Structures are given as C-alpha cells and as structure tokens.
Design a protein around this ligand. Sequence first.
Ligand SMILES: O=c1ccn([C@@H]2O[C@H](COP(=O)(O)OP(=O)(O)O[C@H]3O[C@H](CO)[C@@H](O)[C@H](O)[C@H]3O)[C@@H](O)[C@H]2O)c(=O)[nH]1
Length: 344
Amino acid sequence: MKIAIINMGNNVINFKTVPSSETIYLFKVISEMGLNVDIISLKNGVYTKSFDEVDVNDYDRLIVVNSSINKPNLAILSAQKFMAKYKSKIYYLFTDIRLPFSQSWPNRPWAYLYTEEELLIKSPIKVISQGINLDIAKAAHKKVDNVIEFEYFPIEQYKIHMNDFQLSKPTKKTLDVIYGGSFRSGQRESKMVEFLFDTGLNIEFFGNAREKQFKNPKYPWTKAPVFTGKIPMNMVSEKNSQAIAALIIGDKNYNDNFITLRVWETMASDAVMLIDEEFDTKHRIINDARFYVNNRAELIDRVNELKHSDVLRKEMLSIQHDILNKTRAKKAEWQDAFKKAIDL
Ligand SMILES: O=c1ccn([C@@H]2O[C@H](COP(=O)(O)OP(=O)(O)O[C@H]3O[C@H](CO)[C@@H](O)[C@H](O)[C@H]3O)[C@@H](O)[C@H]2O)c(=O)[nH]1
C-alpha cells in the first residue's frame, strides 16, 4: 500500500505557512500510523518528491489537500495535471469550508500553455469532510461534476494524536483574552468585533490580521485589540498560554459542524477555552455551560470571574485538559477510522 499526499493549491516545503505546515504535519501523522506515504510537490526536498520524479499511478491512494483555485499558480497547475493523469479515486481532505475541491479547467491569458484534457480531472472524488454536516459539504461542492461521495472524519485531531503532543504548562499571565488567526476576507468580522473589540479588557489578536482590515461600517467599534505578528504553528498553544482565556468564535457553515484546529490548540493551552455559543449550541466540545459565552457582555463577565478566582480558572483548565485527554485516549480508533476513510 503506497500513499501520496499533494497540496492542491500551495507549494509544500518547510513550515512557512499554515497550508504547507499542515501538509507536513498531516504527512507526519499519517506516517506515524504505519503507512508508506510520500508528499508530492513542485520540488524534491527533505519532505517532498517532485511531480516530475514520480509516476502518479504507482500510488494506491492519492490524498489531496488545500484547493487554492477558488488565479492559478505553478502549484495549482502542476497539481491539476498530476491529478488528471491519476486513474483512481482521489481522497480530498475538506478542512476549510471556503476551499472545496474544484477544477481550474473552467478558470485566462496563460491558458496558452495548457490544454483541457491535460488539466481535466476525471477520477471520482471522495470528500472527507472535517465537518459532521455532510449537506454543507455537498452544497460546497455542488459545482463539481465529478462522480463524488462524502464522509465525515475529524481530520483536525492530528494535532493531539501526534506522537510528540504535550499539554501546555502553567504560564505567567500578561493578557486577558487572546485569539490567533487571520481576517479571512472579513467573513467573521462581525463576531471578531463583538468579542474582541471594545471589551475594556486586555486583548491580543495574533496572526495575519491587521486593524486596518476592520473597516466595514456595519460593525462599528471604538477601540480595537492589539494586533501582533504571525508565529509558527507549533508555537500557537504556547502563545495562547500567555492569556487567562482564549476564544473560539462562530462562523456560518462551521457552527454545529466543524471542530477546528483552534479548538484543540486552545484546549491544550494554559488559557481557559471560551466558546461562542453559536459555534457549538449542543455543547459537543465540553458539556459545561461555564465554557460558553453568547455575546460580549458575557465574555467580559466570564473573564472577570476567571481573574477573580484562581480556583475557578484552574478547575476549568483541569476540565478542558481532561476532556482533551479523553479524546487522545481514542487514538487507535481515530487511526483506524482514517484508514477506513481512505479505503484501507
Ligand atoms: O500566528 C498564527 C496564527 C494562527 N496560526 C494557525 O492558523 C490556524 C487557522 O486559523 P485561521 O486562519 O483563523 O482559520 P480557522 O478558520 O480558525 O482555521 C482553518 O484552518 C484550520 C487548520 O487548517 C482548520 O482546522 C479549520 O477548519 C479552518 O477553518 C490556527 O489554528 C493556527 O494553527 C498560526 O500558525 N500562526
């Protein structure tokens, strides 16, 4: 059994970006399962083989991640051409709602260098949805003409199942609330302004976001949180640990559907995980109302309660860490489920 992993829209090497980093980490966790796997990208390196140095059909299973299509680039075109020659099923890891599988064929001046068939992917596609709601996954891929099927798998748990995983340790607190991520084209501007702006608390937003991006008049604010630079993925939990609490906010289509990497990065940290009620209305993450907040007013009060009671804060950290460990205890089941998902 030979497996291949390819990032459909981003070059893969080192850990200079979320897509490239997640690809290497997914590659690593799949290898740790006792599976023979290669990462195929633009160039040969310590973690990858080039498209030009391998025969796509020598692989029994082809896993694909990150579809950047929805202005094609070298990575996208090379991936498309590679997938186009593969004669078997493609297993697409749907980890970001905005990035469903799609062919660049429809998507140009440079079109002169490529032909249709050369990029037309005819293989059936199995969408492995990180989200439990498959109707949402189907809707996101409604434009796909390929034969296609769907199945749910909590892909994002690769963080906690990695062999080197460790909970964050008690850390000196210099922040009230922290959130690490990107602006994501303002798709979450309303929630970000609700929970992170004008709270009167000491809040930090780390990652790609900048204050100048929050300019939609529909979501007014007076004072913004402090924005700091991007840091390595393997430093996110340590960064979250500088704060009393770390926030998880809702997103239409993600709500009551996706559990995101952030959930685990936050749960594993020394910061109490506070969740926007709308993101998990049934409290699947933690069956404890103390970890949920409906709006800004509730977030402020909850953070103040945590600051006033070290007992409450430590108790909640103990609870979230325990819950995280209960999931880590199911590693073998998780590994078996992934294997079944890719027909092994
Ligand atoms: O300085 C920073 C800030 C954030 N991150 C990472 O970026 C990830 C993604 O954050 P963001 O860009 O805000 O997007 P999310 O919607 O929170 O997460 C997306 O990316 C996750 C990991 O690929 C998936 O689990 C989610 O489903 C997908 O929506 C975080 O989890 C962190 O791992 C960094 O590496 N450095």
